[PDB]
Each structure stands twice: as structure tokens, then as C-alpha cells.
Amino acid sequence: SPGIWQLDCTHLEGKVILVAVHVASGYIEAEVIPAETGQETAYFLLKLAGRWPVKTVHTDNGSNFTSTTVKAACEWAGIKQEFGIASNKELKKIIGQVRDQAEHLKTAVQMAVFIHNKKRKGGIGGYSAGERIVDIIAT
Amino acid sequence: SPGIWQLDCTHLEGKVILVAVHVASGYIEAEVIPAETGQETAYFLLKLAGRWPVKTVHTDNGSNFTSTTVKAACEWAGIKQEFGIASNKELKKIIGQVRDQAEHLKTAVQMAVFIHNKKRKGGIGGYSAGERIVDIIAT
Numbered sequence: 001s002p003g004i005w006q007l008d009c010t011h012l013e014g015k016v017i018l019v020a021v022h023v024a025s026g027y028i029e030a031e032v033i034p035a036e037t038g039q040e041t042a043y044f045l046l047k048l049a050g051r052w053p054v055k056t057v058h059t060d061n062g063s064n065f066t067s068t069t070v071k072a073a074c075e076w077a078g079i080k081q082e083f084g085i086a087s088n089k090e091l092k093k094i095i096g097q098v099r100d101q102a103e104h105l106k107t108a109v110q111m112a113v114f115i116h117n118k119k120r121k122g123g124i125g126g127y128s129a130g131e132r133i134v135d136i137i138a139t
Numbered sequence: 140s141p142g143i144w145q146l147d148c149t150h151l152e153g154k155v156i157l158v159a160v161h162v163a164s165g166y167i168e169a170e171v172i173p174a175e176t177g178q179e180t181a182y183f184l185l186k187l188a189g190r191w192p193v194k195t196v197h198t199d200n201g202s203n204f205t206s207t208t209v210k211a212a213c214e215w216a217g218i219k220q221e222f223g224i225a226s227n228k229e230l231k232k233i234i235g236q237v238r239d240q241a242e243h244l245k246t247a248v249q250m251a252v253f254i255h256n257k258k259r260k261g262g263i264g265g266y267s268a269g270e271r272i273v274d275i276i277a278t
């Protein structure tokens with residue numbers, strides 16, 4: 001289905017990175033938050049769903065099932081939250097390659113997301129993740 | 140061309156809203172920032188261009204031409220900044236319709252962006268802005 005995402009967290013320099021993956025394309029969006037709160041996840045989901053068809057979000061643990069705001073975001077935007085489900089180390093190599101081009105970690109995280117979404121697999125031919133998600137939604 | 144945007148600022152409850160419009164689709168992305176700094180605009184442009192083809196950004200005044208970080212963002216991401224160029228009152232009516240569904244202004248701003256991007260013109264038939272930008276990029 002064209003609206004399936006995976007949501008996860010990752011950690012770098014004592015900061016928290018929210019990562020959404022569009023499962024069929026590998027497109028990612030990410031955001032650095034001060035702390036891993038309900039509100040932050042709800043805000044991120046609402047932005048995401050305003051940009052793409054988001055039908056179902058898959059997570060790997062219980063954290064998101066206990067936030068009052070995440071459930072009000074789910075419901076407002078029409079997002080099914082489903083339990084049950086790598087990319088998270090591609091990110092980190094690219095973050096390492098750019099880290100000292102940016103003062104702020106968040107900048108490096110977005111430079112990493114950029115390159116993840118724009119590049120071709122193996123550097124030649126076919127579609128980027130950013131091309132594939134557009135191509136998937138367009139049909 | 141498929142990569143042309145308009146960037147502008149707007150103000151509500153003493154907070155600053157950055158608005159990017161995809162000129163051919165009317166798709167919008169927006170973000171509430173504490174203050175109207177170079178860094179914030181650069182960060183927003185870098186996120187945007189990591190998500191969509193952004194070839195040229197049109198602005199209406201000189202503010203963006205005097206930020207060292209905005210120029211380093213332009214150059215890093217391959218974005219031509221061009222001088223010379225409404226939607227900004229559709230936003231505000233919808234913000235008013237949702238305002239007391241959300242504690243934070245930023246939430247109302249994203250609920251407004253959601254509805255702006257998802258709705259059909261006149262409420263029936265054709266494509267939403269979010270459909271049109273995908274349809275434009277897919278060709």
C-alpha cells in the first residue's frame with residue numbers, strides 16, 4: 001500500500017532523532033528534538049501527514065501507544081498506528097562524512113537526509129528514494 | 140519549471156511563520172520559528188530541498204540576500220535565490236477555524252497546512268495541492 005510508514009528514534013551526541021521511512025521507497029524525513037516526548041512525535045506526525053499520504057505508521061515498541069497527543073494526532077489526521085515491523089546506519093555514515101561542514105547536529109542530520117533521498121543506489125542509474133516516493137504516489 | 144518556489148514570512152500572536160509555496164501546485168510547507176534569523180531560513184530551505192526538487196526560490200525583499208548561512212544553504216543544496224515574484228490569508232482563516240483545537244500555535248499552523256494541501260478547490264473534484272505537486276514532479 002502507498003501510505004505505509006515506519007517510525008523510529010535514534011540517538012547521536014545526546015540528542016534524539018525522529019526518523020520516518022516510507023517503506024516501499026526508502027524516502028526518509030527526520031527531525032532532532034530536545035527530548036523524546038509525546039508532543040514532539042505528534043507534531044512530527046502531523047507535519048508528515050500534511051505532506052504525504054500517511055495511512056499506517058508501524059512502530060517497534062510501546063512508547064507511542066502511551067501518548068495522549070500522539071493518539072489525538074493519529075485521529076485528527078486519520079493515521080492508523082500499528083505495532084510491528086538497517087537504514088539507521090546509512091544515515092550515521094553520511095552524518096560522519098558531513099559532521100564538520102555544519103555547526104549544529106540537526107544541519108548534518110538534514111544534509112544526511114538530503115543525500116539519502118537524492119542519491120541513486122550504487123551511485124549510477126534508476127531512481128533515488130525521493131523519486132520513488134513521488135513515482136509510487138503518482139499511481 | 141517544476142522546481143520553482145516562493146518563500147515568504149508571516150506573523151501571528153508575535154511568532155514568525157516561514158511559508159514556502161510550490162508556485163505551479165500551490166503546495167505549501169511552513170514552520171514557526173522563535174525569531175526570523177538567517178540560520179532558521181537556511182535550515183528550512185535545506186529540509187525543503189531534501190524533500191522536493193528545489194531549483195529556484197523567489198523572494199520579495201532583501202532580507203534573504205544578507206544571510207551568510209542562507210547563501211551557504213543555497214550553494215550546498217544547489218538552490219538559485221532569485222529576487223522578484225494571497226495564499227497567506229487562506230492559511231489564516233483555517234488557522235482561526237482550528238486555533239482552539241490546539242494548545243500551541245505551531246499545531247494550528249500545521250493543521251492549516253494539512254487542510255490547505257489535502258482539500259480540493261471548492262470542496263469537490265480535481266486535485267489537491269498535495270496531489271498536484273506529486274503529479275507535476277512525476278512528469
Ligand SMILES: Cc1ccc2oc(C#Cc3cccs3)c(CC(=O)O)c2c1
Pocket residue numbers: 101102103104105107108178179181182183185208211212215
Ligand atoms: C550549508 C548549510 C545549510 C543549512 C544550514 O542550516 C543551519 C542552521 C540552523 C539552525 C536553525 C535553528 C537553530 S540552529 C546551518 C548552520 C550550521 O549548522 O552550520 C546551515 C548550513
Ligand SMILES: Cc1ccc2oc(C#Cc3cccs3)c(CC(=O)O)c2c1
Pocket residue numbers: 039040042043044046069072073076240241242243244246247
Ligand atoms: C491533534 C494534534 C496533532 C498534533 C499535535 O502536535 C502537538 C504539539 C507539540 C509540540 C512539539 C514541540 C513543542 S510543542 C499537539 C499538542 C497542541 O498543540 O495541542 C497536537 C495535537
